[PDB]
Amino acid sequence: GVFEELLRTSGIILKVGEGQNEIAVDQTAFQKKLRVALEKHPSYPGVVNEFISGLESHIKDRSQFKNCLLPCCESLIKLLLGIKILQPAVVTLLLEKIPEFFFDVVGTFGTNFPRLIVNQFKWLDGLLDSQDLVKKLMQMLSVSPVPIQHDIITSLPEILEDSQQNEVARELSCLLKQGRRLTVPILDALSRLDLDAELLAKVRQSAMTIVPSVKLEDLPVVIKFILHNVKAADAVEVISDLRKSLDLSSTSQNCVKLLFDVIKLAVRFQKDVSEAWIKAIENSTSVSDHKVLDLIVLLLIHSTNSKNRKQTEKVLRSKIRL
Amino acid sequence: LVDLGFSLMESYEPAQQACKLGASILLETFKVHEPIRSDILEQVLNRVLTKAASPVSHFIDLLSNIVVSAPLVLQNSSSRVTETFDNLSFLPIDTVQGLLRAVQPLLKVSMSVRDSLILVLQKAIFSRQLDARKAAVAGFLLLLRNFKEAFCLEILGSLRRCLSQQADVRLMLYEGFYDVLRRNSQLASSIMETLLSQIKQYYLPQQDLLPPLKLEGCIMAQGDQIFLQEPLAHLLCCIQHCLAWYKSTVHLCKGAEDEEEEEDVGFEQNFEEMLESVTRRMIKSSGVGVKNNIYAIQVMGICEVLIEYNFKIGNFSKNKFEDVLGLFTCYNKLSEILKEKAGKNKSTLGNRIARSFLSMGFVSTLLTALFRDNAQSHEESLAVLRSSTEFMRYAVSVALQKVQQLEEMGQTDGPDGQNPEKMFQNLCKITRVLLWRYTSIISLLCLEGLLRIFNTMQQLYAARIPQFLQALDITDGEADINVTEKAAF
């Protein structure tokens, strides 16, 4: 194997066996040395393919995937994609690995190749194509399972470059306009892309539509996002809407409790949630809008944070006598 | 009582004595009667982890002492915390540190504390992630919890992307590079190369450039245009102690790895090359000030980090001493926007004008070798510079000021300069060597550090009056009366 000799003389020692391969050279050394002293190979415009084909001839046995994948500075993949002369040709040999490695029955034993093969890109500092990464990536999210979806949308904050934010968020908001396996993941990944002043209220109003038909547990998560950045003068209407949506309890011992949990964590942690979550039921059920949840909340606010004795009082008095 | 504590020993405001008392009621009540204090601790945590800035001192010390006196008081009861911990991303600049430190007792217990801490912080880094993600990344790293497949070198990378955010993130990643090193054993190549990239952008690469470096000639550490990048001196001061780090700083020789086979090449071959450079080239946003004392202050500290590099790089030989003479000529040349000096009078403040100095044993080595107490064979250079007489009796304000702060504000800033014993031993060596040439011969120096050595050796720390009171005694040092013969002598 001519590629094998080129590698071994390049220094990073053979990685044979299930054990982690050992490359005893300087890291910056091993990279600079190999990526210079390959350039004077005979077909200096024509060796790259003949070698990388050996690379794929080395990409067969899955354990070699691990020793390919595993840590050792970075990985022989995860640094070996630093030589810019290979710098645009590595991602293409790799990123197509995720489909055919997305077939078998994957469980709790560990070797989630779709974990590793897309966990390596994060934190990259020099990689050639700035757009083509996210480009191939989005359609790479085309038809995988729900697990592969959790993966590819999992590392979006770091592996994705910091260029096309509003465009990345553009694909995002409609990828999560109305869905089923994108309340946990895609509902979280909104924190990583520090989106602009524009698409924000779009994200916000796009929130409430999933919420009145949200899933079993994710009312905890949906709740955190609803009041997360809601703070501001533009909150109280946020509270009116939030009240109108949520509005009554069906089960969920842990569910009703945790809903009280989030409501209490926010009940004394944000700035104006005190004035608001009261005010939205505090003048705004002219007709039968008072409900269970909108009453039980009267005590949490009225005996949780000690500034609200006289506050919970006159509210309870009017809305009882009237 | 427990109500008396939580509602006096905070809110009470002698007045300082009153609060000091209230510590007793709350703490003692936590002491004796064993069933009724679990709600005491929960009153405390959220009394002092959600408020305005005054709640650092009283309640912060009280939480420190409570948890610290807590012999595993939460050591199987930590369920208020795991939802306290997330609240912290809006606290002030100083409070987030002390919260981390105080809980640092409890962190040693169980992965249910830590496996949730790491997450409720990590999420901060991908997004806005203010100093708090840093105070925390380093605190977990600069701790034994850092010990123990090692993928957390990831977050070790996460900083390395942080390294360009602002100035503040710059200064932070710097100031703790040392300690993170000093604990850190494997994680050496990374701190090395990471620095090399920050400094590979500094200086004209080819020799013969008119300025080896410029106020805008070193690239930067974090920013560099309108918000100083890593301060040129700072970017280098990290470079210096870290430079001492590979062999003799983090690893004394790194014989196994870091200095193994003259490893210096990687972490500092380019270093030492740049070293001899930044000296030899010493021939030759900031309107007036920031330009001078930060950009050309990178030269101020250029001679700062220089004095270390040269005059500890082997400074028996007369070459490096001639060089130090040069650099101080340059620094004194810089003293044009004002003037500056040494120390020669009472030191209940420090010295007359200044900023950061060299290291923390530097007042020691320089003050006790070229300030008297150093007669021997190779006295040539030590006379040559010894005949400075403007660049020694000005080079003592550095020691007079390191001391006139390093007990006026709690912990004086230099690498390995908080742990109170290593504040101590130096705190005494400076005093003896001040004496034996202010009691054996710009002249009131090693004995106008005396108002200062004393007031801030006794009032800001008393439990050691017997330990250090005898120490001034020539060659010795039982009590104020027991060592009264020493006290009378």
Curated annotation (Swiss-Prot), chain B:
Q: What is the location of the Glycyl lysine isopeptide (Lys-Gly) (interchain with G-Cter in ubiquitin) cross-link?
A: 123
| PTM characteristics | Monoubiquitinated by FANCL during S phase and upon genotoxic stress. Deubiquitinated by USP1 as cells enter G2/M, or once DNA repair is completed. Monoubiquitination requires the FANCA-FANCB-FANCC-FANCE-FANCF-FANCG-FANCM complex. Ubiquitination is required for binding to chromatin, DNA repair, and normal cell cycle progression. Monoubiquitination is stimulated by DNA-binding.
**Highest taxon, organism lineage:** Eukaryota
Family that this chain belongs to: Belongs to the Fanconi anemia group I protein family.
How this chain assembles, per its entry, is:
Homodimer. Part of a FANCI-FANCD2 heterodimeric complex that binds and scans dsDNA for DNA damage. Interacts with FANCL. Interacts with MTMR15/FAN1. Interacts with POLN. Interacts with UBL5; the interaction promotes FANCI homodimerization.
Q: What does this protein do?
A: Plays an essential role in the repair of DNA double-strand breaks by homologous recombination and in the repair of interstrand DNA cross-links (ICLs) by promoting FANCD2 monoubiquitination by FANCL and participating in recruitment to DNA repair sites. The FANCI-FANCD2 complex binds and scans double-stranded DNA (dsDNA) for DNA damage; this complex stalls at DNA junctions between double-stranded DNA and single-stranded DNA. Participates in S phase and G2 phase checkpoint activation upon DNA damage.
Q: Spell out the protein name for this chain.
A: Fanconi anemia group I protein
Q: Which organism is it from?
A: Gallus gallus
First and last residues shown, out of full length: 384 to 956 of 1338
